[PDB]
Amino acid sequence: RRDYAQDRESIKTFLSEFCKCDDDGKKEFVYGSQLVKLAHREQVLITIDLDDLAEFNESLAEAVVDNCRRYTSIFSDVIAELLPSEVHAKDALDVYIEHRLMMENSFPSELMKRFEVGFKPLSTEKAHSIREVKAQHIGKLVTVRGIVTRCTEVKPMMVVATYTCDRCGSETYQPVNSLSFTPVHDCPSDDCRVNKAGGRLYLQTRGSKFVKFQEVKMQEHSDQVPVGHIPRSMTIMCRGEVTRMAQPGDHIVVSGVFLPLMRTGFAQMIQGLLSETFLQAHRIICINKNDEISDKDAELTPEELEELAQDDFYERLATSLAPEIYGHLDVKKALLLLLVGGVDKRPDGMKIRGNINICLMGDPGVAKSQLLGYISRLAVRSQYTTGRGSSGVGLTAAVMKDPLTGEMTLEGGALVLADQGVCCIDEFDKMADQDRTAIHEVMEQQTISIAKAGIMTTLNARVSILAAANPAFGRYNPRRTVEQNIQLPAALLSRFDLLWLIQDKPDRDNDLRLAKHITYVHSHSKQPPTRVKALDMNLMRRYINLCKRKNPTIPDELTDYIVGAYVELRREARNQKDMTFTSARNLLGILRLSTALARLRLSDSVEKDDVAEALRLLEMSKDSLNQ
Template identity: 70%
Template sequence: KPRDHCLSMGKCKRFLQEFYSEDDSGKKVFKYGAQLVALAHREQVGLVVDLDDVAEEDPELVESVCENTKRYTVLFADAVHELLPEYREREVVAKDALDVYIEHRLMMETRGRDPADMRDPRNQYPAELMRRFEVYFRPPSTSKPKVVRDVKADSIGKLVTVRGIVTRATEVKPMMAVATYTCDQCGAETYQPIASPSFMPLIMCPSQECVTNRSGGRLYLQTRGSKFVKFQELRIQEHSDQVPVGNIPRSMTIYARGENTRLVQPGDHVAVSGVFLPLLRSGFRQAVQGLLSETYLEAHCVTLMNKTEDDELGTEDLSEEELRQITEEDFYEKLAGSIAPEIYGHEDVKKALLLLLVGGVEQAPRGMKIRGNINICLMGDPGVAKSQLLSYIDRLAPRSQYTTGRGSSGVGLTAAVMRDPVTGEMTLEGGALVLADLGVCCIDEFDKMADADRTAIHEVMEQQTISIAKAGIMTSLNARCSILAAANPAYGRYNPRKTIEQNIQLPAALLSRFDLLWLIQDKPDTDNDLRLAQHITYVHQHSKQPPTHFTPIDMKLMRRYLSKCKKRQPVVPEALADYITAAYVEMRKEARVSKDTTFTSARTLLSILRLSTALARLRMVDVVEKEDVNEAMRLMEMSKDSLQRRRRWSRLRPRLPRLSRLLRNTQSRTTVTRTTRTTPPTTSQSCMTLTATPTPPPTPTNKHHKYTTPTNTQHQPIYNTDKYTTPTNTQH
């Protein structure tokens, strides 16, 4: 319905003057009156109007602001411009070049004007040139943020809020808000307010003198008398959990001006509120563009989600029934089993992935940073569901990026330097690791990456930053993410005749940065193969996991619980320090004695601490207990044992045929007794008894006796011949 301009202006002025809130002592505090005083004295630039405050005074006005934000931005700016002289208590001493320019023009105007002319000489200047403040709206708390792909044509001109991750941020440049021209014939000044990012400059002088004399004066731009504001272009991309299956992430252009610039950088998760507008070009570009129009969001409020409660996952408290459903008996096994329930087995691997999602506690004592994120590498034979596990973690984590080794370069993982199409300057565009900040980056086919590209993630895995020194840009970007990599052995399948280093073929500097390096093998086992085949056929027929003794936790509920666990900051008590130290020394001793073992360094000790604090977070406690340390060391030993078992038993394989032949020969051989003559034996004629006794085969010792685990059928030695005898079946 049509609205009266004067009536709307009166509402805006009345709200700014009369709105107040009471403090603890019951005293009235005029919130916007104090801001107007700061604006009048040039102590503040931005006036932020909270629409929740407007809703208390006039709910209808809030609806009008949300529906036609651009118009009410001008109305509130006009209201502030009229009210500022009333709130000015003293003269402003600090003056910029534009103030001096306008004062000089007013002084010249006053000298040459007619005394009978009562018009205010300031009225000839546009209001945008005289103002030194900016008006922004903060959306009401009742409005819900939209997904980028849901912001469509019906949102044009309205106040909308979108969430996403910043992929590109240009340098802050001055943008012209009011252009001032001078005529070369009559000397008159012409002012052109600019509302869009592009404009067509004026050429002919529109003054009365040039029109009357038909002198055809040309206008020349005067940058000294023009007004400029800070301008920055942002590019945000929707989060991975907001992208439907089979679609690519959508992006949106954000135009930030004034006080909203320099608030974010690539990799930050933000919530941006602003006006959704079409990009109106001028001249030849508009003719080429045709009927189509690009869109952008004019930012009013930019909120960093990294420093606040980043999403609604942490704001909604879990109900008692939901907590009881999660924290019942064996909740650790239940949470681990709820990760990719359609994948059979891999219990310990799923437990490790659960701890990766929770993460450890980050330490930053006196500037030295110790990461809390957990890095895991899954290596194994083809067809053991490594990629399926990565895909599920990518869907489960609220912030994640999924990439492959061959499809990623070092620049694509870290950051790319690109030329901005608007300003023509070199800008940074974040890669997969930057976009996965405070999340998980899943890298499949990790072994297929080139060595030069793989070295780009060394700094990320330990320092959690990406340092850039390219094209004159020297900066450091945050990449506080966990790395989940999947790789195949160097020969396609794990070769037991080769050493661990020959099978993995990854540098020690990279292996030491992984907290857990897990080898998943495809072992022939009749019973296990039968259960696996039944599981796969059931999933293929019904598109869900088979019925089990427990019901997997829903993905949304699990995501909310893990988000709640991340708020805990458990500490390691001093009583456990000696226990952890002794365990680490024992692991180093075993690594020194055994030649075929994985790389063990001081980073292994930090890995145990990270896993222990992650387990304490999972139980939602503030102190790490001994059981947490034992479980962390058990997972560490199981990951090492998965690599060492094949190598340990493969060394016995060449001896087994020789030992069996020796055993058969000695059983058929009799005791040979050779008796010499009755004369005393000489050195060459001795009475000897040769008895051949079989030599028992060496039994493998359990080097990990300190952290022994219950026997698991999935970790049995593969040379137990009795285990693989199958009953005769006529069908086969």
Template identity: 70%
Template sequence: MTNEHRGRWMAGIILEWNWVGKEGMGRGWLQRSRMDYFTTTTTTEKKTKQIARFLQDFTQEDSKGRKTLKYAPQLTDIAHREQVLLEVDVDDVAAFNEDLASSILENTPRYQSLFSEAVFDLLPQFKEREVLAKDSLDVYIEHRLLMERRLRQPGEIRDQRNRYPAELMRRFEVSFKEPSSAQPLSIRDIKADHIGKLIYVKGIVTRCTEVKPLMRVATYTCDQCGAETYQPISSPNFTPLSMCPSDDCRINQSGGRLYLQTRGSKFVKFQEFKIQEHSDQVPVGNIPRSISIFCRGEVTRLASPGDHVAVTGVFLPVVMGGFRQMTSGLLSDTFVEAHRVVKMNKTEDEELEAAELTEEEVRAVTQGDFYERLAHSIAPEIYGHSDVKRALLLQLVGGQDTSPQGMKIRGNLNICLMGDPGVAKSQLLAYMDRLAPRSQYTTGRGSSGVGLTAAVMKDPLTDEMTLEGGALVLADRGLCCIDEFDKMMDQDRTAIHEVMEQQTISIAKAGIMTTLNARTSILAAANPAYGRYNPKKSIEANIQLPAALLSRFDLLWLIQDKPDRENDLRLAKHIAYVHQHMTNPPMAFEPLDMKLIRRYVALCHRKEPYVPEALDEFIIAAYVDMRKEARNNKDMSFTSARTLLAVLRLSTALARLRLGDAVEKEDIVEAMRLMEASKSSVIADTQDRLTGRIQSVTDRVYNVIREMSSGGATKTMKLADVMERCATKGFTPTQVEDCIAHYENINVFQVNQQRTRLTLVNA
């Protein structure tokens, strides 16, 4: 009676054998296993030869169209110890053999070993000279090979890889680069099906350990017979050998003990860091997922906390050893064995989105008054706040960082929204958090100084103190929204001072002294101290924030809830429509989609406009006038040198928004108008309440025109100069034209027929 059974061999080969009584069992299994062994060996040799042909013969075209060998020169550098890492592009393998490329993606550790064997066999062919700079491990191996050659019998052929572990003999590393068609996986999309496969994942580094030596091959020496024993190590933990396994000690039963030889062992650099998925990949109500990345050799020291990285590696379970293996149960931790770590630069991931923006889409966005259209497309469900939305749009675009002679001047814009409760400050923050490609949202009461900057954590793997980045570090190259900014503790709020100006976080904790990047734009919202804004008090008294912190904000907006019948009627209709139809009311134009805005902003980030020298005098004169008015009017806001830098940042953002290469005069005028509008939101209401007289917009424009005429001998001026001066004071062209028309009707102003000159009659 014959029964068929199936078994799995250690190498992963499925064996089939027949039970033929007690006598035939051993012979049948042995015969079949020998046949499968030779078949597997033959297949491995074919694969190795195929890989060797690929490394020797693969060519690529240079810029002039000439074909050159790609990997052969690298093998020469590896043989001469001028290069350590051989990075194999899977696209190159696919061009050579698609089946081989598919096998690499499906069983990466196996083919990494085959590539290493092929490179080891090819190195003698590419070695043109002896290596002069040798380390202790080179001398150790050469000495052992020389002793073995002396003891070898005449005519005996022995492969040195059979005696010495392969990891001990190799002085190079092999890694794979993901195919160009690979799409990055979200961390929560990595499943058990990906174990052993090459994956491509993106995230932000939250924690990073120090680089430590990791033992790969342990070398022991027996105190009785002097024999050497090698122990390859593949897991984070291992049990050292204690008894000598050599034939001399076993036959003589001498019980020799093994002692570890550190200089003869093989160590590699090891580093672990954790990456967390981006905020736009986290579903609403879920906690961000994270995964550990193990880096070895040349892949270490490529990332730090707060960096946005793209990791190519193998998804593997953690192999436990010793007592932990018996107590771990059925569950296993997982990690990614890194093959390639690429730090995403300022706009690399955003340029990928911008590359999909066609010319028709760019024309559709930039047609007409696209500045107003983009601004009103930000939170269209929220009524009003036109200038605030313009400022938020410019904050999303951002300025340009400059570093003259080593001194860094930030280009990011910081904005603070102050005002009464119920004016949609938090809603604007929430919308900007969803709109920005990289963002972090937090609240002042729920955030500590450590949570905003960085925390010192004890690493469970190495028991060392490591840094884990906070909200400002995680928002590097992005936007950090802080609601309830006034509710923060004073000691926690001081941690933001360095970030808002220097764009870095200096850490000196638990023996760790370092500087982390926090190149983020801060959007804060604060409520008055006593419920509503008190115009008889200063800004710092109302918001209870220090002047040193408020001066670091480029724009301070005071949003008040003033009773106004017409405005209240429009607001109520707007809210009722949104509540009933779950969308914004009909507008003069169709608001742009959030994805289209994000892609257009990514396209704007590729521009680096400069400020022409011809505009220097205009900028200087405008700043001097701002300082003069602030001194005369006892300005409760802050007009300092930082105000001038804020104007330059706003004008650069405007030039970026229109995809310009240089800043124009109109950009500076609009930047100063936004600056004056933000100041007037605080100053105008305060001065009106103190004097008991509320000035209309028309009266304020008239005062500006009178100030222009009082400085000269003539009462006639160019209308273009009037429009420009009023724009720098925060007034729109429509408001200026209404004022001129009003006073022209009562014969206070006279305008010529060409509408180019204005004269004050009763000045």
């Protein structure tokens, strides 16, 4: 329909006649700045935005969006043989080319790639959805948002493979762009022509190319899936210089071109003219939980100082966590201790784990699943599962074929990936019988031993654990005791730092309090009125991260009394014969909480009153049935 000549001149004019003066100090050539940047051998891929091509022309402002495959290759050979501006031996490919001509069937300029171009639409055009890519999205560079899943690692793709007969020194060019091909016969040359002087040519990657070639799987948002449907997926082939531009768990926004795919093979199942398509892209601007929306890619001090001195309190950060009810204040703050932690060292070679793991016991209506489902959202890199929501292999590693290689590698479960954070579990008792050993193993941290292949199954899990389960028929029968009313492994009950049971007996005036508390969750969408300024989650995210980097010392001036505190601890529970267990690991636990609590001081000034809260914390953690 359109021409390849005046169009060529128009795009050259665009390349040159371009000093788009968006503001003051813009009187030079933007694409000419990019040109000399190519001349630096610094930049190797230009990104393009419609505003330039919005103001220049209109054809190719709408002509390239549907094809994207010709005008780019014209752009390629346009700039490939434009040398307006050394050194030769700097790039491994170019230095191998200059090896090969310093040593000295025409070479293409496709061999000397040496620079690329992508695109960048204007106004991430819109969030077009993986479902709605209907029968008009062939070739069109469409903007869409998806969800990442099951990423693999960088692989080198090939474009041009050269042989050499070794009898005529032939340097053949056998370029390839698909997946499969075959090389050429022994002598497809003229010196090595039908004349008998022929050997057999052989490949040399030296004067050949390779390319970054990453592959991942792409799953749906699970927010716009149909009402009675199931999540779908699509495949990625992110080429060029964007390999390693996604991670498992990034709500990414990918912009590229849909294309078809020919899985060449058996002409009956395949070869049915059914088009098992796939995707192509250039630009990965992940708008959710990536380098863009999350800064520091939290330690940036100046931007937060204005709010830092703007407030000075702790409980203000306390009840800002799940602030839609009232009650259970002392649980939330210590839970916030779980997010930070921050006690790391290598003392005497032995590494100490600083991830608190606590449970929730007793559930005649407490909102047990609420704190878990909330903090698993706010807590970056969280998960959630239940008793029969997953088998043992669902929690641990697994196996699956690999589209990158097919190595049949191991992929892990929820706990396999939630390390350096907190994996949430609910209703622990009915999880499984052998599962208790599976959670017994994390108490010797960074140790996930499996018998899947049963060889080593080594793995480094550095996760916390947010446990929560229910009592059996009844809730502390008048004669029953711990390990009697509960039917959990008491050895498992031993390996925690804080045990947490939540029992609510009738309180004739607290019920009306919560009734007016939660009923206002429904007439509107915000609980705390005019009594304190609960903090935004987003500022919470950085305010927690800044506290982590202190790693204070320990006060010897109170070490003399921390042991006395352990004395009164182990004695006032020991005054009776058969109270619940009181463990010798308490002194290894009390040290681990006061540190993270001082982390939010960011001061290395752990004080005598610092543990004064921890003492009552463990004090009430037990003796929860006295009244």
